[PDB]
Amino acid sequence: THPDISVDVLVIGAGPTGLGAAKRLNQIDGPSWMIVDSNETPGGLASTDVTPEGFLYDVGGHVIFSHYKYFDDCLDEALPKEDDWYTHQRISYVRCQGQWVPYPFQNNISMLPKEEQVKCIDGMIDAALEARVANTKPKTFDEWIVRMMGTGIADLFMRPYNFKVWAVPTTKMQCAWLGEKVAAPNLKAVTTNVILGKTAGNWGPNATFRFPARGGTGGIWIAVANTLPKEKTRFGEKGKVTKVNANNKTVTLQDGTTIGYKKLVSTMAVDFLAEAMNDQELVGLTKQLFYSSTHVIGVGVRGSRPERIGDKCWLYFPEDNCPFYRATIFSNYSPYNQPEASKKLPTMQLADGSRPQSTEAKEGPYWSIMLEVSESSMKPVNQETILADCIQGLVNTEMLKPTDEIVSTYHRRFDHGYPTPTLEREGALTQILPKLQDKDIWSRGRFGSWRYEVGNQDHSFMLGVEAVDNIVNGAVELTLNYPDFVNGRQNTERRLVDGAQVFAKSKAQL
């Protein structure tokens, strides 16, 4: 029997990856296509929730810094107005020994206690000498750390923090993933700073960035989705894929609709895809991948932004006096992420956990904090007490004063948080992805292709754009297979308007 619908290229999922695919498919305007999503609102893990009190929370707080001009082009098309964006400078610190060490930590030893400083430089010297002679390569993420920073920093920050976020020991992870993620410290630069007491916080793709004025990052992906022809979309319960028949190239949707395809671009989690295919081999294969779940906690507090907080952006917490690994002053990103000062809200509780002095609706202004906590079979979290442990954690780290007035809470558990860069990961992926490609299925995205190196909105979006370009023009998928390549260059060649469109336009005016 024939499918209810037939198209050349079918995109599953409307997060950044999928929309990337849809944008390029829309630009080329050649083969027929369709994008579906089980959610009425596109954006996936890049979406935004709002509390009953009017606070916005990303999925951990998201940040736009682009390696691609194509990515930029599409954002400027969705949000063309100027007052649609704010530009920020990256103010990032690490919490250590009661200090706010400027990021990257390994580059600002100066702020630590003198006692600790000595232990870090000692380690760094032992490594710089051993690295002067090394000929082999690091096997684990742990070996990589010890070699690039020394034991001083490893025990002080790297080891404890990484477990805290990955929910697995540094010894169980690979190291080919950390190109532009972890800074390798230069002895000359580290000591120079310790001597001058200066700071080095320019490092990284994060230095400067922009944030959407309204709707958080979620509003971006809504704006983008609006540029696509509606007739080619299915968002909501009518767009969930419940079965994938790779053998006869059909997909079955939640309401029973079937779609035939020639090429399939899938952005759903590859472990879910295996299930929906009912393929025993792929299931056993995907079950060798590892992932951590992420608890996002949102806290809205009353008052004008404290001076202790200032223009800070996101913070790191390697110490065990709080459950979360990262915190974001989400209210500094936009004046529309929290209620306006005039809005009246009762105090739900004080930061220390006790009842407020007054429960009457008072005015603002307000600010917001967003926290992330990791969870895995190696690092369990109690779902009934986590919110309380975070708030307390906030006090322990001098983020909030015990007497601070909390006006709103938020808590959500995302089962698939991070795709874990385990030692076994590439062993499994190098099987799965080619096996899926041989069925004409491009599985791409954070959990589509499972590579954290290149998980991230701009990267994921591009993974999509490239999967289409590979399917239609034979383009090599650079972002997928060569993360270091795309990350250390300016990717300017592909644009939202290429020659193919320019020529086709003049040929019509001709």
Ligand X SMILES: Cc1cc2c(cc1C)N(C[C@H](O)[C@H](O)[C@H](O)COP(=O)(O)OP(=O)(O)OC[C@H]1O[C@@H](n3cnc4c(N)ncnc43)[C@H](O)[C@@H]1O)c1[nH]c(=O)[nH]c(=O)c1N2
Residue found by looking up tokens 């230069």 in the block: 186
The residue from 129, 361, 497, 502 that contacts a second copy (CB under 8 A) is: 129
Residue found by looking up tokens 């499918």 in the block: 3
Q: Closest CB to ligand X among 318 and 417?
A: 417
* Helix, strand, coil share of the chain (percent; to 5): 35, 20, 40
219 binds ligand X (CB under 6 A): no
Residue 192 interacts with which of ligand X, ligand UDP, a second copy, none, CB < 5 to 8 Å by class:
a second copy
The interface region with ligand X, picked from 25-33, 56-64, 192-200, 347-355 by CB under 6 A, is 56-64
191 binds a second copy (CB under 8 A): yes
Neighbour-count burial for 468-488, b at 16+ CB within 10 Å, e otherwise: bbbbbeeeebbbbeebeebbe
The interface region with ligand UDP, picked from 33-41, 100-108, 216-224, 466-474 by CB under 6 A, is 100-108
In 10 A of CB 91, how many CB atoms? 16
311 binds a second copy (CB under 8 A): no
309 binds ligand UDP (CB under 6 A): no
Residue 37 interacts with which of a second copy, ligand X, ligand UDP, none, CB < 5 to 8 Å by class:
ligand X
CB of 128 to a second copy, least distance (A): 7
The residue from 81, 114, 230, 507 that contacts a second copy (CB under 8 A) is: 114
Rounded to whole angstroms, how far apart are CA atoms 160 and 154?
A: 8
Residue 183 interacts with which of ligand UDP, a second copy, ligand X, none, CB < 5 to 8 Å by class:
ligand UDP
In 10 A of CB 73, how many CB atoms? 17
Rounded to whole angstroms, how far apart are CA atoms 444 and 15?
A: 11
For CA atoms 76, 50, 374, 446, give the dihedral sign.
negative
Residue 409 interacts with which of ligand X, ligand UDP, a second copy, none, CB < 5 to 8 Å by class:
none
Rounded to whole angstroms, how far apart are CA atoms 469 and 371?
A: 37
39 binds a second copy (CB under 8 A): no
50 binds ligand UDP (CB under 6 A): no
The residue from 9, 36, 223, 429 that contacts ligand X (CB under 6 A) is: 36
15 binds ligand X (CB under 6 A): yes
In sequence order, what are the residues at sequence separation of 6 or more whose Cβ sits closer than 8 angstroms to the Cβ of residue 93? Answer: 100, 101, 102, 103, 312, 315, 316
In 10 A of CB 113, how many CB atoms? 12
Q: Mind giving me the DSSP string for 235-250?
A: ESGGG-EEEEETTTTE
The interface region with ligand UDP, picked from 80-88, 178-186, 288-296, 466-474 by CB under 6 A, is 178-186
The interface region with ligand UDP, picked from 17-25, 66-74, 175-183, 398-406 by CB under 6 A, is 175-183
* HEC per residue, 35-62: EEECCCCCCHHHCCEECCCCCEECCCCC
Rounded to whole angstroms, how far apart are CA atoms 200 and 188?
A: 13
Residue 240 interacts with which of ligand UDP, ligand X, a second copy, none, CB < 5 to 8 Å by class:
ligand X
The residue from 56, 156, 165, 175 that contacts ligand UDP (CB under 6 A) is: 165
Burial bucket for residue 69 (CB in 10 Å: 0-12, 13-18, 19+): middle
CB 108 within 8 A of CB 101: yes
The residue from 298, 393, 421, 455 that contacts ligand X (CB under 6 A) is: 455
Q: How far is CA 42 from CA 238, 398, 410, 459, 472, in A?
A: 14, 37, 21, 17, 24
CB of 319 to a second copy, least distance (A): 30
167 binds ligand X (CB under 6 A): no
The interface region with a second copy, picked from 152-160, 184-192, 338-346, 386-394 by CB under 8 A, is 184-192
The interface region with ligand X, picked from 13-21, 125-133, 189-197, 357-365 by CB under 6 A, is 13-21
Residue 151's identity, in one-letter code, is T
Q: Closest CB to ligand UDP among 5 and 381?
A: 381
Rounded to whole angstroms, how far apart are CA atoms 309 and 419?
A: 31
244 strand-pairing partners: 251
Number of residues interacting with ligand UDP: please give it, by CB under 6 A: 10
CB of 178 to a second copy, least distance (A): 23
Residue 103 interacts with which of ligand UDP, ligand X, a second copy, none, CB < 5 to 8 Å by class:
ligand UDP
In 10 A of CB 13, how many CB atoms? 28
Q: Is 259 helix (H, G, I), strand (E, B) or coil?
A: strand
Which residues are at the interface with ligand X (CB under 6 A)?
12-18, 36-39, 44-46, 59-60, 62-63, 239-241, 267-268, 294, 372, 417, 445-448, 455-458, 460
Residues that bind a second copy (CB under 8 A): 114, 117-118, 121-122, 125-126, 128-129, 132-133, 187-188, 191-192, 195-196
Q: Note the residues at the interface with ligand UDP (CB under 6 A).
A: 94, 103-105, 162, 165, 181-183, 316
